[PDB]
Amino acid sequence: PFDTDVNTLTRFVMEEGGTGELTQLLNSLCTAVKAISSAVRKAGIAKKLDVLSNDLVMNMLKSSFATCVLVSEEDKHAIIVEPEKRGKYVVCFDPLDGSSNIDCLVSVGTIFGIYRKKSTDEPSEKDALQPGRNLVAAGYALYGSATMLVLAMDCGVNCFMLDPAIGEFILVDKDVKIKKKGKIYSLNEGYARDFDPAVTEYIQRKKFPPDNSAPYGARYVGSMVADVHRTLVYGGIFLYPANKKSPNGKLRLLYECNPMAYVMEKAGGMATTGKEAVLDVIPTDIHQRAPVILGSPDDVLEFLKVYEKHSA
Amino acid sequence: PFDTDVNTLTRFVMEEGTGELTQLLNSLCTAVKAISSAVRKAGIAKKLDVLSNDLVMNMLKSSFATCVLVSEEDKHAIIVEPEKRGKYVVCFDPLDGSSNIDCLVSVGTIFGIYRKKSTDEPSEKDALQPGRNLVAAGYALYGSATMLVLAMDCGVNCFMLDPAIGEFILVDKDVKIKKKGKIYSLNEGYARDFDPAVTEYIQRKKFPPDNSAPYGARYVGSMVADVHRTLVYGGIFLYPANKKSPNGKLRLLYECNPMAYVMEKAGGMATTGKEAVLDVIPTDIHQRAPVILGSPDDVLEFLKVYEKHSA
Amino acid sequence: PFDTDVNTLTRFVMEEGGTGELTQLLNSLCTAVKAISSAVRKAGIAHLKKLDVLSNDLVMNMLKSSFATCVLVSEEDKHAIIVEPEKRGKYVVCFDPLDGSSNIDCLVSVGTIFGIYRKKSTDEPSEKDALQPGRNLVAAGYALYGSATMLVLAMDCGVNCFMLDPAIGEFILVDKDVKIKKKGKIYSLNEGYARDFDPAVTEYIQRKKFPPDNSAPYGARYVGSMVADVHRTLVYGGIFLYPANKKSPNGKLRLLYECNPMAYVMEKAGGMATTGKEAVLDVIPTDIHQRAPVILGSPDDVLEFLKVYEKHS
Amino acid sequence: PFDTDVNTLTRFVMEEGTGELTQLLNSLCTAVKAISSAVRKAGIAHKKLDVLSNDLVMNMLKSSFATCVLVSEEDKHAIIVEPEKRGKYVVCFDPLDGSSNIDCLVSVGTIFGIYRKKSTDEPSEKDALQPGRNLVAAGYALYGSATMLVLAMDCGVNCFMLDPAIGEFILVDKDVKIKKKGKIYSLNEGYARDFDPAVTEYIQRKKFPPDNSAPYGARYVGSMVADVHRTLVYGGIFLYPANKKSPNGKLRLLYECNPMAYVMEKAGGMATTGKEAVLDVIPTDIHQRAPVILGSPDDVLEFLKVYEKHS
Ligand SMILES: [Cl-]
Ligand SMILES: [Cl-]
Ligand SMILES: [Zn+2]
Ligand SMILES: [Zn+2]
Ligand SMILES: [Zn+2]
Ligand SMILES: [Zn+2]
Ligand SMILES: [Zn+2]
Ligand SMILES: [Zn+2]
């Protein structure tokens, strides 16, 4: 019949360990996710969604009593939590990534990164300018044909599916590991005119393998969360690289790149800018961009060997 | 057109003040949502009593907030292993009214929470505390909507389950029962076994001495439904003692005490006839207690009748 | 895993048989029921009469849009509603959109009751087409919005129960050719009105509490919402009473959209439904909102009430 | 508050005109809602999904009393409906297109094409071998971040979103028209080595425009329903063309190409094999393949101008 020992995201977080603030934080975040999932599922019947999602995530995070500094893709400055509701965590989030293409029922998502406040001073925007290497937890919610929450922590990557009947995230995939080498490459080839020669050579090798091996398949949803999730589940490589026109790439470091890089690394994958690990970049602005190449370690290493040969 | 500042049961509990009570009530809400879903699909999918009991026990142990668990479905108290233990003692009725589930009658989960008072290892004895010691108590009613009624020192608040997002939303703040109602509730089928005070009291409701209008009668046969109606519309609910059942039928720990606590926190009353239900010092985890509860003026009217048939 | 041959209310109605208008009608009605169920389940979060009005509007709009109806009688409307010629069909529908709604705030089960007739007359549709005895019913039943949502449907072939599956928004067949127990052990009425009871009611109730034959006294149940009390009577057996007295010589319940549909379900389940003088289904109405006394349920219990009733005048 | 005049798929079909088409589309919607639910819970529950979806669609269609011949992607031969349940329509369907990549939560879908039986003999597989031009109705259900049913008929294309709260398809987009020219191209560029020169040249013009205009963006989900739906909603072009290795393309004519081509044409778009309209191909086998280039009329015409210059 029905399962009596329901393995929820809450139970999982509680089992991992201090004070209990991380559980409070992730529980509040799950409330926001469920509400966003519901609004997305009814979108047609009901920039509106970006604003609503941002408000939901901000309100739920402030009310958790677990956070002090909140950085969102939708706000120019960091939001400082009032002392009454404050906690010890710094949260960087992307409330509804992929929303520009919502009308085609493409998967959209909420991306998040959690840091423990490291400084000995009052909370400020500066507390969010930490390299992704300092992440305590990071992940995303994918609003697709099912709602999934992927959570990475020091112990690894775990996937939780939203059960619509009981409104709970259930553990479905334990200690997820990416394949060593995949057979799919993912990037917007529409920008080929602006590509760096290393990118052009790398793609050419995927379509025309020198070694008689089978050409890779191509997939590009245009929604970061969907493209990263497919990379995690099936293996392969995802690229949003730098070029002469965009020397720092297009994607945002704090709430797009770093969380995805952390999930990748905790799954046994890689995430590079080409020059260094995405997680090693020390940000100087909360909205700064970063180039990103991530996925299966053998595929990223192959890209890096091509990248090196087009370097001084 | 959607609310951005969602007022959940979790937010409410957190605002009232380690954080163990919040963890406890959050785990309980998970069990409630799962029970609600199973009840809503019962025919498409007795066994529900067992499932509900297992769900509530597993969720409570996993909260890290409990040390002693007493259920209507278990002979002895369950002691939580040291790894998962916390400071609270929980008495619960996982699926009250389940014998009549097939008629789509409202069923419910009743619960009572105590902070461990003793200075020793947790035991069954920690559950033998008068209802007066309750930290929190309430019920989930699985009816036309799913409602969670929560009573604490600050009062009674009602939360409705939002099916779209699986969260309990605050719908009724600091709930107060009417001073006097116009409905009486008991199984009149047992009239042959009634104590004369009960017979006289019911006769006064049907044939008022003062020319006032006779009260209406309602009896669902599901304690949570009958108590909830009493709270919302006022009046009186009776499951009293008689010659055959000198201690009543309902169970003190996980039926009477939680309902009595909700009643008192709503400005109502809950008596055995001799004393407040909350004042009975239990000696067995499955002991019975007579119960008369509701609108204070209605219960006082019953007590005046009860006194004249005493001494 | 999952069931591949889903037995829906729609499939069931289609299998029973002409033109296909009855299926269209019951499909439209199910849409209204699902929307009412949802609104009831969220009542406190949303609402903050409202639900009576909404339910009535939903049922009216869905029925008109089915292309299966010509005359609609509702508890909520003074006169019958005549369907515009464009959307006209051959059925007459009497309904109670949200019976028990006065007590909605206590999460008591509420319900939608319905009765369907074929227009018998050779003239233009009018209110008069709804003034037909229950014996003429083609289909009748109710939706119960309780701990689960159930649709009970009676037709010439019998009574079938369908439960709403919330995951797929469809009514699934759960109970085939439902029959009430010959004799039950529960009686149901508002005993608060004892002062106004006719002696036959008083004596009957006394026999239930104080059995002459040493048998066990019956249990009492009274929800105060007709659909809940009738449904419990169907499922567990027993008797339900809303009888006539000196003050209300015609009873309290409404014949067209409360009594007749419930009486039809009862008779099709092997039970009984009487006014005391005749079968509820045999009353020829003269007004769309006329009242009728009703005693229904297990055939042995209703017969036992009638034996007491016969001894009086 | 709540909308009282609910505009459902059923109401819409009934308004367009025995009533067999309504019965057929209503049964199909039941199957779609059940597939949507199973997809939404896929991981919590468990090729299995392909089989389940196929069984659901077959059973619901047979039970509608509206069909006589059923062709599915999952069955080698056509299914002939038993005399008792027989109706006048022929249905070609793809029960769970894109299912090979289900685990990445990519949008999947059900594609369908409906024909009226034209022959005056006993029903057979041959009744399904009709050109897409003969379609009475066609469309798809997209199981994505929301569930949508896109329905094309002689009158045009209409989109219905599944309302999870009431389990009904609600009209959200009336008489849908594709943009004359889009700014997105969609194909698996991983197969570039096998491309015919006209495809290679066409793609090169999209990345390197001769006229100083902005290069097009690229999108390729790898699920036909998702890629076609994005093309309808935002405009542009979708290509699954013929090459030396696959002279007839990869996609199946009866239950993938023809339904998508009919939706495209009814939206003011185009759908070509390169030599003719997909809808004009006279099938000879139920599982035959067809090359397909579809979308915004100006974009498809621009591909055809390149195609014309080659052999
Ligand atoms: Cl591997
Ligand atoms: Cl029997
Ligand atoms: Zn973003
Ligand atoms: Zn109980
Ligand atoms: Zn009524
Ligand atoms: Zn007499
Ligand atoms: Zn396919
Ligand atoms: Zn050429």
Numbering used by the authors:
A (entry chain B): 6 to 22, 27 to 55, 72 to 337
B (entry chain C): 6 to 22, 28 to 55, 72 to 337
C (entry chain D): 6 to 22, 27 to 57, 72 to 336
D (entry chain A): 6 to 22, 28 to 56, 72 to 336
Authors' account:
By contrast, the translation vectors in the ab plane vary by as much as 4.6% (5.6 Å) from zero or 1/2, indicating that the reason for the breakdown of symmetry, which prohibits an I-centred lattice, is owing to lateral translation of the hlFBPase dimers in the ab plane. Although excess F-2,6-P2 was present during crystallization of hlFBPase to facilitate formation of the R state, the electron density does not support the presence of this competitive inhibitor in the active site. The structure of hlFBPase contains a single metal ion at position M1, which based on the crystallization conditions could in principle be Mg2+, Mn2+ or Zn2+. A search in the CSD for zinc- and mangan­ese-containing compounds revealed only 103 small molecules with an Mn atom in trigonal bipyramidal geometry (0.57%), while a Zn atom in this geometry was present in 498 small-molecule crystal structures (1.87%), further hinting towards a Zn2+ at the M1 site. No metal ions are present at sites M2 and M3 in hlFBPase. Residues 55–70 of the catalytic loop are disordered in the hlFBPase structure, possibly explaining the absence of the other cations. The hlFBPase structure exhibits a number of interesting properties, including a metal ion in a comparatively rare trigonal bipyramidal coordination bound via a water molecule to a sulfate ion that mimics the leaving inorganic phosphate after hydrolysis of the substrate.
Inhibition of the liver isoform of FBPase (hlFBPase; the other isoform being the muscle isoform) is therefore an attractive avenue for disease treatment. The subunits are labelled C1–C4 and form two functional dimers: C1/C2 and C3/C4. In the enzymatically active R state of the hlFBPase tetramer, the dimers are little, if at all, rotated and the protomers are therefore arranged as an almost planar rectangle. In contrast, binding of the allosteric regulator AMP facilitates rotation of the dimers by ∼15°, leading to detachment of the catalytic loop.
